[PDB]
């Protein structure tokens, strides 16, 4: 929840938007501007894919709201929309009921993926009918159509998968899980490519054994069950399961202490390890736990020695506006150009994240005046009603 | 007790007093002035009601006695006079016999409401008579009148509910609890609207099964009984119980440390979570537990990023007088206009809370001179007899 | 892993490259420049070999990237490519699940070698054939050729040892371990010296008892098994095993505290002890654990009294280029002279380790533009894409 | 080991070298210069011998390498070459597996001697022959010669005692320990005094009971075995054992904390206690454990009140040369006068201990150039190759 929540403001980020030369496109994969850093992340992506990252980590350094989290996430997108991305903040290690290296370990395990191939008993086909009498469904394969009667329980799941008549689905016989594959090929046009949104009519019987591929994390297995690692290694050896190290993003790196960096240095050498990407908005800091050793970003030298550092720069109000616009678009929030330009300007006086967070309040304030679009007047009101943290701390200082 | 005590100086606060446009009325729902902040809280109220507050919290920032606690409480009033409001101060986490995240957890559970529908055996009707012989009572429904004989125990409860002959009540057969519904409809005039202060004659028998609706908190269930959460979830699924997240108000936010903020960030993402409203009267502070990281209001950035910040401003002596007046009125304390004007002036030299606390001492000092109203002379004496903390610390400094 | 990883950037270091007079050669054994220090390490090497190091330790002092780790490793090379070298950093003692003197102890035991003579049942000879039917192998000795059939398990090991037809190998009958001795003498030319890359045809039978000599560390025995020390001493007394104290390199010496130095002082007097070599890039420091005692490099006087101190100096960009070149050559990375000269210059503005770490990213960036050699343009791009820690901390400071 | 190691650089120190008047001789008992302090230690020696030291301790104060450790050791020599001398440094109390007052206690017990008279079964005499056939030995007393056949075990011990034919020895029948008494009287000349290097032919039989006198410490009994103290007191009462309190030397006195000084003050009043001699190279220091109480040498007043303080002064390069010469002579290291004069000069720029430690490296560097004597050129090279701690910390500071 905190993590899905954490990644929601980045729902538009699909990758780094580079061309084949590895250079940044004007605007692609959701990203605009920040081109130098995007290109540096692309080198990281190639290094990771080449397995030339052994014992290295990444550090994104720059001010608040300069896309450090977006860029980390984009790296994981470029390895695959499948690849696990686990964002944390360093202060999360300080907790009253769990040791700090158990927090780190847990976050490591969230960042290591496993693709498991299993054969399951299913009922599958094109959904020829949905008739609540319980719900009757007809499923069609190349061999013909068969009727099922579904309990409310499986019907709810089918409704959750947004299954409609015309879709190809399967229903796992044991768990009752419903998977929507796409729309059946029968109904595709000449605009619709092969097996994408539209998929073939399944061959064979409605009721059959089907080879399914689950993407799970090593943490997702903990909750569903040391003993784990043993089974996982069995499965890889049998080519039943395949490891997929992901990305561990550690914002607020300076909140880590010496014991945390000792644990991290060691862990990131594991062959199955995720790539570790740190983020910092600070310069030189006393390394926490030492009391007097000052170091770039609060990271010990022997670690910094293995860290590839990419700088992120402040956006102009013009760049910020382009990004605020992607967020509004992605959110389904209608907003005038003048309103967006004002939000850009507010962002430059505060941060990008502050401007972005004003969209939802401005939108509701628009709805309340019977308007279905944010206008400049609503941005103006909202920004007089609410304060950024720097402005508020300053007023109260003075 | 400490919490009812905590909310007593806000007994006049009924809501935020905004119009349908969401703009502040001159004086409504007990609030006067502080209009910008009241309007910002109204946006929060709509966001909460729309469920657009996921992963956000609120921060009220301003000096002492600028209505931060009043405004938080007003938000809970606007969600419902039913909705749980739990005020705490951050230093309450530091306690010798309970861990700091057990304090926070307990305060979370006080801030989550549960409406439970139950059917109980009752005796109900209009109270046709009260005759202490034990006490004889006649209860009347549409089917007729029946006599009961009450033990002192239930009579005491009935007396506590301020039940008079003419009122419609019920008496729970098992617990012996007495509920006063209102005055019977039979005696209402043409000024008295339907089922308000005045309620219908109940239909059916005096003795019957009645569907009652209890508002409890998750903390109120702890005391009357992990195992709880299980039963509660059962009841929601059965539509027997309904959750009502309330408001958790955390004043003195800078007294929280890093472990507290890690626990809070996580907790406030729970789907059943109350809205968290922080309050601060400070500017930049070392985040407690870090020793060197300075931050607006002593809150870590990753939290501040999710916090909507509303500023509260100092009242003029004129505004303060309006508020001191509401408090006197609400208290039943008679006071001259000149006395109120003096209290306004004292408030500007000290704080609003200091002026407000002088009413009760001034009133007693009035009674002692045979006066049934506070006059300027009594405010003058009281303010020479007692000191505000700033004045006292200064005298002793010097 | 962290340790093999730790020694990888020094894979070119074969010794100290001194002549018989003990003076530094222009460039030999992988080292270039740093001649004074290399000559001082050569005195240490002779002292150790003479056993005149009793109760002394070594300190390498100089800035980051001046070869302190290389020189320590080179000392161990000069005692033997066999001699254990264990590099650590002082902050590694601070760990959440292991005491600080258990870290030190473990690192001591990694730095003490044991040569064990054992007689094992083997199959050996020249590999006359490799035929996967399982894999058939013919092994030839002076007495003739014998066929074996190997399971996939031993075949994998043989493949790991890079065994080819024509090589002399042995296969341990019990463990199944494969050892490649070299190419058979039969196929050597007049350029190929006796028993080096090329080794004799083994005498006797394919199947025989063979005296093998394993080099292990005292830590390598822990993992494969107090009780250990007892057995080890038995074996030395029987001339079955022979001790070989190695080198313990402790970088970041100032991260050690007083309890660590008390433990180290004592341990390094053990007769079986490794030589301890410290490294420092700092001047006077508060001795950690004391709060107020300042001392050269953060080391207590009574220790400093027993420490032989060798200074390492900054390389010019010209020297740095020579070293960057050895690393590229050793890596198999093609790079123009102009590109190397630029990396030298970058190294002088940053450190040698930063320049060296740019090779792999520059190389991949070269491959991506279809180039099989790094050119100046790729060094330029790479250095604009990535930042050194000093530059990044400075930008964010300002 | 650490302690024998600790006393090795003082192997030339035989006493304080004073005349009968108690005044310092130019050069005697290994000491040169430092005359005032030597004379003050001589008063201490007489006070101790008179038992007028009850509740007093000694403090040697002066810079590094001014002979504080030498002088402490010399005091113990003057009480007897037998008398236990236990040197420690105050930071040794801070250890992870032993409490700080258990370190102190252990060091107290090392500093208390016990002379035990025992009668043992022995074989003794003049060694008339050594014939390895096992080894045959003939032992001769006044009653005649007897042959023994020794196992390798006792022969090794005899070889360790440097026993030659012509020496008078005994061999303990039970333990197998070999003691070399000296050369037999039969072979002495008129230059050789009675019972010194040369001792009489033993009277009686080869095999006999012999009264032997072992010098042990109370710590030496711990390792070979509270219960101890009981037995020891038994033996003193029986005149079987005799106590000999020694000297406990505590360098780095300012590393002791308040709990250590409380334990020490108390312990040094024991009747069996060693004399405690502290050493300091510092002026006023915060007493460790107090945070704010400043005191000469970091010692509490009530202790300082009982401490007799002797100052040690810096040596000139001329005095230092005399001392460097004694060390070379004692070591068997040949060195020119010019080389010694250079070492004196180096010592004045650094410390005496630094110059002294350059002898062994300079000597090896001499051997390497085929020279059997250190010449100025070798001192020059060695001092350019290695650095003193002050010089190294300074370079790296700057
Ligand atoms: N170059 C960019 N293109 C598109 N979106 C961006 C870009 N940079 C930042 N963002 C977005 O702007 C918001 C703030 O960026 P974020 O990654 O949180 O910054 P940081 O982590 O540096 O504080 C996020 O919603 C993020 O997705
Ligand atoms: N705008 C307002 N209208 C009515 N009452 C107010 C207003 N602001 C503050 N109060 C009341 O004044 C007193 C002080 O305000 P409070 O909410 O405690 O201030 P704070 O929490 O900022 O110190 C309380 O009794 C409160 O109910
Ligand atoms: N004189 C030298 N000759 C060859 N390689 C060197 C030399 N000095 C340093 N190196 C190499 O340069 C890199 C940096 O040196 P390193 O030993 O890590 O420096 P330090 O430990 O002082 O920071 C390593 O790859 C090392 O092998
Ligand atoms: N006056 C002296 N005569 C002979 N040797 C001395 C004299 N002073 C010091 N030494 C010797 O010089 C070296 C340094 O002296 P040491 O006792 O360790 O000094 P400190 O303990 O004050 O640092 C030792 O080898 C010691 O035996």
XYZ file of N, CA and C in Angstrom, chain A residues 36 39-40 46-47 50 54 56 62 99 101 258-259 262 265 269 280-284 290 292-293 296-297 301-302 304-306 308-311, chain C residues 1-2 5-6 89 91-92 94-97 252 254-255 281-282 288 353 357 360-361 364 368 381 384-389 392-393 395-397:
210
model
N 20.295 14.726 -19.750
C 21.603 14.207 -19.341
C 21.430 13.036 -18.394
N 19.973 9.931 -20.048
C 21.037 9.274 -20.786
C 22.035 8.514 -19.878
N 22.408 9.097 -18.745
C 23.215 8.359 -17.759
C 22.480 7.126 -17.243
N 22.122 -0.478 -19.614
C 22.918 -1.391 -20.451
C 23.945 -2.156 -19.627
N 24.554 -1.498 -18.648
C 25.514 -2.153 -17.774
C 24.853 -3.299 -16.999
N 24.110 -6.138 -19.340
C 25.395 -6.795 -19.620
C 26.032 -7.477 -18.413
N 28.510 -5.564 -11.217
C 28.945 -6.323 -10.062
C 29.693 -5.430 -9.087
N 28.687 -2.548 -7.977
C 28.487 -1.110 -8.140
C 27.067 -0.807 -7.718
N 20.400 15.355 -6.412
C 19.854 16.611 -6.813
C 18.745 17.010 -5.897
N 14.372 -4.682 13.761
C 15.747 -4.213 13.589
C 15.969 -3.532 12.237
N 18.424 -3.804 10.045
C 18.856 -4.642 8.943
C 17.783 -5.668 8.539
N 26.100 3.668 9.901
C 27.230 2.832 9.558
C 26.922 1.331 9.509
N 26.175 0.840 10.482
C 25.729 -0.537 10.469
C 24.870 -0.856 9.255
N 27.351 -1.041 6.180
C 28.051 -2.309 6.275
C 27.167 -3.476 5.792
N 26.534 -2.877 1.749
C 27.723 -3.139 0.943
C 27.836 -4.656 0.665
N 26.463 -7.429 -3.159
C 27.378 -8.362 -3.833
C 26.764 -9.729 -4.094
N 19.947 11.401 -2.931
C 20.395 12.408 -1.984
C 20.027 13.757 -2.495
N 19.581 14.639 -1.612
C 19.436 16.035 -1.950
C 20.399 16.912 -1.150
N 21.373 16.286 -0.521
C 22.299 16.966 0.370
C 23.720 16.927 -0.148
N 24.574 17.789 0.387
C 25.999 17.798 0.079
C 26.731 16.960 1.106
N 27.761 17.537 1.723
C 28.561 16.824 2.722
C 27.819 16.704 4.017
N 28.856 7.930 13.258
C 30.283 8.235 13.480
C 30.509 9.455 14.328
N 31.667 12.266 13.775
C 32.575 13.261 13.216
C 33.072 13.043 11.798
N 32.811 11.902 11.166
C 33.329 11.710 9.805
C 32.349 12.287 8.773
N 30.673 13.121 1.354
C 29.629 13.388 0.370
C 28.342 12.597 0.606
N 27.212 13.300 0.789
C 25.891 12.656 0.884
C 25.734 11.755 2.090
N 33.238 6.543 2.121
C 34.133 6.506 0.962
C 34.178 5.132 0.314
N 34.347 4.084 1.086
C 34.513 2.818 0.430
C 33.245 2.465 -0.336
N 31.076 5.009 -1.625
C 31.078 6.017 -2.678
C 31.982 5.618 -3.846
N 33.056 4.899 -3.527
C 33.974 4.369 -4.506
C 33.343 3.430 -5.518
N 32.236 2.818 -5.151
C 31.566 1.845 -5.979
C 30.243 2.378 -6.555
N 28.098 4.919 -8.894
C 28.014 5.761 -10.089
C 26.995 6.853 -9.805
N 27.427 8.106 -9.894
C 26.656 9.281 -9.488
C 26.145 10.097 -10.685
N 24.838 10.264 -10.712
C 24.142 10.995 -11.741
C 23.467 12.171 -11.081
N 23.646 13.339 -11.655
C 23.071 14.549 -11.181
C 21.702 14.824 -11.842
N 33.399 -13.171 -1.850
C 32.848 -12.332 -2.970
C 33.233 -10.851 -2.824
N 32.828 -10.219 -1.724
C 33.226 -8.831 -1.487
C 34.751 -8.732 -1.533
N 36.027 -9.426 -5.200
C 35.582 -8.150 -5.749
C 36.526 -7.044 -5.348
N 36.902 -7.020 -4.061
C 37.826 -6.021 -3.533
C 39.206 -6.050 -4.193
N 37.805 -2.972 5.659
C 37.691 -1.548 5.991
C 37.238 -1.467 7.459
N 35.247 0.302 9.237
C 33.829 0.396 9.537
C 33.084 -0.933 9.499
N 33.690 -1.966 8.934
C 33.096 -3.314 8.913
C 32.945 -3.945 10.280
N 31.446 -2.594 12.713
C 30.157 -2.144 13.257
C 29.023 -2.821 12.505
N 28.494 -3.852 13.125
C 27.539 -4.720 12.501
C 26.579 -5.175 13.575
N 25.345 -5.438 13.172
C 24.225 -5.628 14.090
C 24.095 -7.043 14.650
N 24.733 -8.011 14.000
C 24.553 -9.409 14.391
C 25.855 -10.121 14.763
N 40.867 2.450 6.377
C 39.910 3.233 7.219
C 40.208 2.961 8.702
N 40.950 4.729 11.105
C 40.330 5.659 12.059
C 38.899 5.313 12.445
N 38.251 4.388 11.725
C 36.967 3.893 12.110
C 37.063 2.884 13.239
N 43.963 7.936 5.153
C 44.066 9.109 4.317
C 43.872 10.394 5.123
N 43.929 10.275 6.434
C 43.651 11.381 7.336
C 44.868 11.776 8.144
N 38.667 7.148 18.308
C 37.281 6.824 18.440
C 37.088 5.960 19.690
N 40.910 6.311 -8.699
C 39.877 5.282 -8.643
C 38.659 5.737 -9.466
N 37.300 3.675 -12.790
C 35.939 3.173 -12.840
C 35.182 3.653 -14.074
N 34.878 0.892 -17.855
C 33.816 -0.025 -18.217
C 32.573 0.688 -18.829
N 32.071 1.753 -18.183
C 31.009 2.581 -18.823
C 31.395 3.199 -20.185
N 31.330 0.334 -22.837
C 29.991 -0.024 -23.233
C 29.381 1.045 -24.151
N 28.138 0.551 -28.062
C 26.825 1.055 -28.479
C 26.853 1.911 -29.756
N 31.886 12.078 -23.117
C 30.450 11.894 -22.849
C 30.257 11.314 -21.457
N 30.712 13.704 -18.686
C 29.607 14.643 -18.548
C 28.360 13.965 -18.017
N 28.234 12.669 -18.180
C 27.047 11.944 -17.758
C 27.080 11.573 -16.287
N 28.280 11.308 -15.791
C 28.503 10.852 -14.409
C 29.368 11.852 -13.657
N 29.220 11.870 -12.336
C 29.919 12.845 -11.466
C 30.759 12.133 -10.432
N 31.867 12.740 -10.031
C 32.614 12.302 -8.833
C 31.942 12.849 -7.589
N 32.130 12.165 -6.469
C 31.474 12.535 -5.205
C 31.756 13.953 -4.699
N 29.739 16.232 -6.967
C 28.312 16.218 -6.640
C 27.982 16.865 -5.283
N 28.807 16.646 -4.258
C 28.476 17.145 -2.884
C 28.553 18.664 -2.928
N 28.057 20.724 -5.636
C 26.937 21.313 -6.351
C 25.759 21.444 -5.403
N 25.513 20.394 -4.622
C 24.349 20.362 -3.748
C 24.554 21.167 -2.489
N 25.794 21.289 -2.025
C 26.129 22.269 -0.981
C 25.690 23.635 -1.478
